[PDB]
Amino acid sequence: KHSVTQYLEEIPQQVQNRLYTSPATCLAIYRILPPLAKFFIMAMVFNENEVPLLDLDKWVNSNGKLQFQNAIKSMKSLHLLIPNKSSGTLMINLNPTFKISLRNALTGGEVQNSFGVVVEENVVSLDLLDEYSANKWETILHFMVGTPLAKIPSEKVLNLLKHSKLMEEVNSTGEFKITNEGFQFLLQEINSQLWTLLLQYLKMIETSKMDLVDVLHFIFMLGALEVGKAYKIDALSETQRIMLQDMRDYGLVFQKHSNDSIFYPTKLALMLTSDTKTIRGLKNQDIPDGSLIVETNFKIYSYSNSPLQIAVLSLFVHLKARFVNMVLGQITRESIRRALTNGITADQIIAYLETHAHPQMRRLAEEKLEKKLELDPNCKEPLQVLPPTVVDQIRLWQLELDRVITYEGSLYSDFETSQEYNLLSKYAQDIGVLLWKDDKKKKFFISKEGNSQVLDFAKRK
Amino acid sequence: GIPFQYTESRILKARLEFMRENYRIRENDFLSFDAMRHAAQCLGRVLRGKDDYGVMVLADRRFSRKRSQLPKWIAQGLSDADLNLSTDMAISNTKQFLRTMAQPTDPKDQEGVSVWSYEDLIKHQNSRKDQ
Amino acid sequence: SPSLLTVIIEIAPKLWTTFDEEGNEKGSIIKVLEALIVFLNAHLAFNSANKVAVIAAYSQGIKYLYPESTSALXXYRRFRNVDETLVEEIYKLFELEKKQIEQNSQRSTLAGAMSAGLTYVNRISKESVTTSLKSRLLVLTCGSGSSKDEIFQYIPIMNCIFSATKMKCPIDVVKIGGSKESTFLQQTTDATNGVYLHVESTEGLIQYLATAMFIDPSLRPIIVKPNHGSVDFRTSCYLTGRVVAVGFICSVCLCVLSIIPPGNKCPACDSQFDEHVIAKLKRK
Amino acid sequence: KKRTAKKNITPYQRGIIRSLILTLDCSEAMLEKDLRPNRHAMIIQYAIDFVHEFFDQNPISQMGIIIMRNGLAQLVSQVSGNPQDHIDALKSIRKQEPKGNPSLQNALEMARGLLLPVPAHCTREVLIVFGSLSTTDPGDIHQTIDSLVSEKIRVKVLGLSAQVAICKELCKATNYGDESFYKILLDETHLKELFNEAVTPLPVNKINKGFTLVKMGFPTRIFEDTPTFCSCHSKLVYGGYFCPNCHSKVCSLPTVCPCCDLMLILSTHLARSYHHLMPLKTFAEVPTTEKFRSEDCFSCQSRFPXXXXXXXXXXXXXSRYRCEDCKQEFCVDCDVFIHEILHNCPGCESK
Ligand SMILES: [Zn+2]
Ligand SMILES: [Zn+2]
Ligand SMILES: [Zn+2]
């Protein structure tokens, strides 16, 4: 988890304070925080007198009071609060801007931005655009995955992917295929897919029109609700418009055509901070949408399917014979080499497959599990929960296929004594260069380019 | 087994002579029935009151041919599928029947027909059974 | 790790009027609900939009408030409804009063109100097939006179607690009114593992609320903030009304007595007492 | 579409202060495979839950355990009040396995002495889980049965997949003739509630002695966790209750007074009963057309209770099991639940 929070906190306070104007964000980020934060924030939310510290520690009893640190670190980490060690104590209060940025929002303040959604005549249909972006939102996966349909045609979007370079494919030939990031691309479907990308916008977002609130606000304003109009008409900065253009271009925004309106709030924006139900021509029903068979017979077992996720699942198994709702494809010791041909371990595969395609394998989780949870100490010999038999073989083949590690560069060789190692190689294991730390080796390893602190101290020894 | 007496002598047979020579009866006629005449003769003791119940097994191959000589209520109580049972198939039915019967199987409502609500249903049903 | 809040609020117009008499007539419960009104919004903003529910106990009876009982058939637009939608019903219900209502004050619908929520909690809980929602409810009351302590509700309330435990749903109560701490309630919160604050009326307790009533839902690693001891020498000798600690519970009647009993016919069960045994009580 | 315990008719008397001695057959008969590890394991399994389940509805009732192996009566757990002690005593045995026949005659007599010490009001009561198909009795029985009656010892057995006259006689005799207590299961799921039904008290049409006042008191919590000490376990209990009369500490419990010998509960234990005292008439299903009440549950709030005309679905079931005495409706699960967990009829509560 990249934990967008981590991206968030990267910036200094003035920028943080810059952003806290848009109230919904303050609320949005409020959701982000661990509960203690959420808790104590309220505790300070409506008392306009900075407060000591031990009191808060005196709020918590024993075990769990570590989260206090995990709490207080976080808030301090982004410095929402302002410490005051005036009287030796810590007099504390939020960034009042942010605090009022909340309170105003919390009790109907002057939030024109967070309340930028100017509702209008609702022309939105449920199936209306339900995949209308979902197509573009799905096709991009294929276009990213590399498939029959040019679902990844966004020149900016592609240039984003190329700029993002998270995909392991031949950009020289144009490919940005399943790298580990591509594998990760397969990994975090919605929360991962959205966020994992969204930063790419920021990743590309460095050149012109910083306007981060007008950027971020365009996000959480989207993250707010399907207000449709009242902003896309006017209530958005030009940075919003480009973001609006980008959002629709990213698909993540439910903006219709004609380039003059308030775009609808596509479901994605809900999914952006949902962590809830996420599924959604006219046939759109799950959970069986992802349909497949998991078992120790090394094959495709597919009645239902996601007509891309299949070829996605193929990315570790050879397609041999497509049929209407089934395909002959043998996922075997041979097939797994492909995920290693890309290189990524199919370890993500395990739980995901133990999580996905079970819609077609629901009788499986009882033909296999038998709920072998409480009978654990009554039998020395459990039964396939969760099915490891191929997974062991996988884990077997895992090393068995991998079975090597290579290094390259120069080779430092035949050192002198136990300082350069136990002065500056556990210190190379303390300044992050080494590509081998074998103490007695008297020889150590890096990657050729990586010496800026490697031909520097052993000379000094 | 199926009871028999020709362990003994012409005493029956010599008697059978007159019996068979006069009455159109063969030894078997006498034989097959009379064993049954003694076979179920045991069984009638098994039940005293309609409260009671029990299991009545028969252990001989030839009983299969002998289904058609029972007292009527017996054979009515005898179902077809119980024919030529082996032990395994037998033990199950009792295993249930015991378990089942042991339940306080007291409908206390359908007993009107079978226990004839007193002075009323005999009045009722036999007024309806007046024909 | 979301949850569910289910406020339970009485509206005792007598007490609500007495609330004007109490302290000052400087703004009745109209202040309170206001303070409450926002308080929910936090709970909404708090978790991953974990749901809430409100049930109210008017004079003649009770009524769900938030969940918007079948009716047709700014403020982040999700808050804005929840309250102003509910507010309608509070007003719509507020329309429901008159002296005929004012005549049948023979009980306080409080207890039954509590029950309904539990049901409602179970209603959600039992349907809560996916990602089970731990949950807690909350009570408030303009504790006033005209009944220093109703006693019939004793039983049913206590039946709530047993359920609450089994339902694992803590309760919380915020009494505002005369300095008469409802042991019943105070016991309840303690047994239900909640809090209690017989605070005064004037303040807009949102300060209390966020602090004192945001704690449980899932968190509960944390010190309760209750008052002093919750002495559990329970209901007075029903015969007398004298709170008991050296009790005398009769028998199959289960009534609670002092040394008072008439030696016969438990003054809730027509059960003449074992005279020899009754005498054996005099053994001191 | 209904199977209702029609009328809640003690109607005024049920046996609260109980003294139940649970006895389990532990024989090779218990080692037959009708149940998965055996009957015996499921037994001890289903016994475990029982204890809380028992002590839940009966926080005022002592209880103890007996096993029956090798034709021997073998107490396992002294009759007491804590569940846990009882509860743990099972698991110990649960791993151990039965040996030798069940000697019913040994069982009761060990109980007969065992149940002597309890006061008169305490329902002197025993429950049996027989597993075998016969017994091995060291002494007489028909005489032995009578001795029980002389002591007013109700009994009840959970027959295995059979019926045996003597116990069938035993229950019948010991419940003053009027019998229902010889239940023998036909299905394992039945056994589940078979324990559960044993939880409640058990009068039907009683004879009435002098049911006396029960002396008792109530303790109060303490504060200083540091000042730890004890007076019933003599340990350093961080700090707990104190006798209203003896005024001595005690490990937290509904226990008796280890200092001046009286019963000390809080009250909730009493409250825990009363639903047993006056339960509720069942919520009645509604007519398939005449209901016409709100399209939303009362107790819960579920819009349906019907189907708004769905051919063979709306007329299929008037999902409106509803109360009589308050005459207010109620949801399906609600009535299922309000009759189950908390009894406290909401509609009948508020009027
Ligand atoms: Zn002790
Ligand atoms: Zn004492
Ligand atoms: Zn009712």
Query: Cβ(D292)–Cβ(D318) under 8 Å?
Result: no
C47/C65 Cα distance (integer angstroms): 21
| C3 phi and psi angles, rounded to 5 deg | -155, -160
B117/B113 Cα distance (integer angstroms): 8
The protein residues having their C-beta less than 5 angstroms from ligand 1 (an ion) are D 230, 232-233, 251
Which helix (H) or strand (E) covers residue B72, if one does? helix B72-77
Whether chains A and B touch (3+ CB pairs under 8 A) is answered by no
Query: Cβ(B87)–Cβ(D172) under 8 Å?
Result: no
D298/C113 Cα distance (integer angstroms): 11
Q: Which residue has the tokens 């936090």?
A: C42
In sequence order, the 6+-apart residues with CB closer than 8 A to the CB of D125 are: D15, D18, D19, D20, D21, D115, D153, D154, D155, D156, D202
C264/C250 Cα distance (integer angstroms): 10
| Closest-approaching ligand to the CA atom of D243 | 2
**CA geometry: angle D297, D303, D307, nearest 5 deg:** 115
3-state secondary structure chain D: CCCCCCCCCCCCCCCCCEEEEEEEECCHHHHCCCCCCCHHHHHHHHHHHHHHHHHHHCCCCEEEEEEEECCEEEEEEEEECCHHHHHHHHHHHHHCCCCCCCCHHHHHHHHHHHCCCCCCCCEEEEEEECCCCCCCCCCCCHHHHHHHHHCCCECCECECCCCCHHHHHHHHHHCCCCCCCCCECCCHHHHHHHHHHHHCCCCCCCCCCCCCCEECECCCCCCCCCCCECCCCCCCECCCEECCCCCCEECCCCCECCCCCCEECCCHHHHHHHCCCCCCCCCECCCCCCCCCCCCCCCCCCCCCCCCCCCCCCCCCCCCCECCCCCCCCCHHHHHHHCCCCCCCHHHHCC
Q: Which residue has the tokens 């055996």?
A: D38
DSSP lists the bridge partners of residue A448 as: none
A399 CB neighbour count, 10 Å cutoff: 9
Helix, strand or coil for residue C164?
helix
Q: Closest approach of chain C CAs to the CA of A224, in angstroms?
A: 7
The DSSP call for residue B45 is G
Whether chains D and C touch (3+ CB pairs under 8 A) is answered by yes
Which helix (H) or strand (E) covers residue C7, if one does? strand C3-10
| A168 phi and psi angles, rounded to 5 deg | -95, 90
Whether chains B and D touch (3+ CB pairs under 8 A) is answered by yes
Among D64, D58, D55, which residue's Cα sits nearest to residue D23?
D64
A365: left (phi over 0), alpha (psi -120 to 50) or beta: alpha
Considering CB atoms only, which of D220, D270, D346 is closest to C115? D346
Give residue C222 CA to ligand 1 midpoint distance, Å.
28
CB C221 to CB A60 under 8 A? yes
Among D154, D149, D143, which residue's Cα sits nearest to residue D182?
D154
Q: Which residue has the tokens 């002695």?
A: D209
B72/A319 Cα distance (integer angstroms): 72
Q: Which residue has the tokens 């339940």?
A: B103
| C14 phi and psi angles, rounded to 5 deg | -55, -60
A376 CB neighbour count, 10 Å cutoff: 10
B15/B6 Cα distance (integer angstroms): 13
Characterize the bridge pairing of strands C134-143 and C3-10. Answer: parallel
Q: Closest approach of chain D CAs to the CA of C154, in angstroms?
A: 9
In sequence order, the 6+-apart residues with CB closer than 8 A to the CB of B6 are: B12, B13, B31
Q: Which of residues 64-93 of C touch A (CB under 8 A)?
A: 74-78
CB B99 to CB D180 under 8 A? no
| A435 phi and psi angles, rounded to 5 deg | -110, 15
A437: left (phi over 0), alpha (psi -120 to 50) or beta: beta
List C-alpha distances in Å: D62 to A102, D13, D48, D55.
58, 20, 16, 9
- Number of helices followed by number of strands (H, E) in chain C: 9, 6
Among D34, D12, D111, D35, which residue's Cα sits nearest to residue D68?
D111
Query: Cβ(A286)–Cβ(A359) under 8 Å?
Result: yes
D272/D60 Cα distance (integer angstroms): 10
Chain D neighbors of B104, CB-CB under 8 A: 180, 182-183
A89/C39 Cα distance (integer angstroms): 30
Work out how many CB contacts closer than 8 A connect C with D. 169
Characterize the bridge pairing of strands D214-215 and C248-249. Answer: antiparallel
B43/B41 Cα distance (integer angstroms): 6
Q: Closest approach of chain A CAs to the CA of C223, in angstroms?
A: 5
Helix, strand or coil for residue C10?
strand
List C-alpha distances in Å: A66 to A40, A63, C216, C218.
15, 7, 18, 17
Q: How was this structure determined?
A: cryo-EM
List C-alpha distances in Å: D335 to C69, C217, C239, D284, D322.
19, 27, 34, 9, 7
Helices C183-192, C154-167: inter-axial angle, 10-degree rounding: 10
Displacement of CA A233 from its chain's centroid (Å)? 32
A450/D220 Cα distance (integer angstroms): 72
Instruction: List strands edge to edge, sheet with C134-143.
Output: C62-64, C52-57, C3-10, C134-143, C173-177
Query: Cβ(C53)–Cβ(C4) under 8 Å?
Result: yes
Among A146, D341, D316, C250, which residue's Cα sits nearest to residue D304?
D316
CB C231 to CB D220 under 8 A? yes
DSSP lists the bridge partners of residue C4 as: C135
Work out how many CB contacts closer than 8 A connect A with C. 71
Give residue D115 CA to ligand 1 midpoint distance, Å.
25
Helix, strand or coil for residue C52?
strand
Among C155, A276, A20, which residue's Cα sits nearest to residue D276?
C155
Helix, strand or coil for residue B122?
helix
Chain B neighbors of D183, CB-CB under 8 A: 104
Query: Cβ(D92)–Cβ(D80) under 8 Å?
Result: no
Best probe of the C interface among D52, D199, D212, by most C CBs < 10 A, is D212
Q: Exposed e or buried b for every residue in A35-60, given b needs 16+ CB within 10 A?
A: bbbbbbbbbbbbeeebbeeeebeebb
Query: Cβ(D30)–Cβ(D38) under 8 Å?
Result: yes
List C-alpha distances in Å: C282 to A21, A372, C258, C263, D343.
78, 62, 13, 11, 38
Which helix (H) or strand (E) covers residue C4, if one does? strand C3-10
Chain B neighbors of D184, CB-CB under 8 A: 99, 102-103
A319/A311 Cα distance (integer angstroms): 8
| A315 phi and psi angles, rounded to 5 deg | -55, -5
Instruction: List strands edge to edge, sheet with D62-69.
Output: D72-80, D62-69, D18-25, D123-129
Polymer length of chain A: 461
Q: Indicate the resolution in Å.
A: 3.0
Among A223, A224, A219, which residue's Cα sits nearest to residue A237?
A219
Chain C neighbors of D341, CB-CB under 8 A: 122, 162-163, 166-167
Displacement of CA C271 from its chain's centroid (Å)? 34
| Closest-approaching ligand to the CA atom of D264 | 2
3-state secondary structure chain A: CCCCHHHHHCCCHHHHHHHCCCHHHHHHHHHHCCHHHHHHHHHHHCCCCCECCHHHHCCCCCCCHHHHHHHHHHHHHCCCEEEECCCCCCEEEECHHHHHHHHHHHCCCCCCCCCCCCCCCCCCCCCCCCCHHHHHHHHHHHHHHCCCCCCCCCHHHHHHHHHHCCCCCCCCCCCCCCCHHHHHHHHCCCHHHHHHHHHHHHHHCCCCCCCHHHHHHHHHHHHHCCCCCCCCCCCCCHHHHHHHHHHHHHCCCECCCCCCCCCECCHHHHHHCCCCCCCCCCCCCCCCCCCCCCCCCCCCCCCCCCCCHHHHHHCCCEEEEECCCCEEEECCHHHHHHHHHHCCCCHHHHHHHHHCCHHHHCCHHHHCCCCCCCCCCCCCCCCCCCCCHHHHHHHHHHHHHHCCCCCCCCCECCCCCHHHHHCCCCCCCCCCCCCECCHHHCCEECCCCCCCCCCCCCCCC
A191/A302 Cα distance (integer angstroms): 26
C192: left (phi over 0), alpha (psi -120 to 50) or beta: alpha
Give residue D233 CA to ligand 2 midpoint distance, Å.
14
Among D109, D84, D99, which residue's Cα sits nearest to residue D21?
D109
Maximal C-alpha separation, chain B: 58
Helices A23-32, A212-224: inter-axial angle, 10-degree rounding: 70
Helices A96-106, A35-45: inter-axial angle, 10-degree rounding: 90
Helix, strand or coil for residue C196?
strand
A175/A180 Cα distance (integer angstroms): 14
A138/A267 Cα distance (integer angstroms): 13
Give residue D130 CA to ligand 3 midpoint distance, Å.
41
Query: For residue D106, with 0-12 CB atoms within 10 Å meaning exposed, 13-18 middle and 19 or more buried, which class applies?
Result: buried
CB C75 to CB A114 under 8 A? no
Best probe of the B interface among D161, D171, D187, by most B CBs < 10 A, is D161
